[PDB]
Amino acid sequence: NIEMAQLESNDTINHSKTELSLMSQDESINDDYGSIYSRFVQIKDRLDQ
């Protein structure tokens, strides 16, 4: 029974740690900023060109 509870606790620990450590949502900010910077670059560099 302690092993079954340890199984549920193991799945819980794994899922919780995986969800908490990296949700992949943090990369969206750098992706947006990178995209905006990409637009600014593609504009200004060609303009100066």
Binding site: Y37, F40, V41, K44, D45, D48, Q49
Partner: protein, 51 residues
Amino acid sequence: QYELSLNQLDKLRKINIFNATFKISHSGPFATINGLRLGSIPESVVPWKEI
């Protein structure tokens, strides 16, 4: 790339001066034109072909 773009902006600010090529500035006692020293003093004379 953005750094290169800013460098191109400064290069544009310098490109506003594009009308100046042969342009003469003042260096030492004399004034040189586009990097060519003109005139000669009693101390250090310049070359004839340079003038």
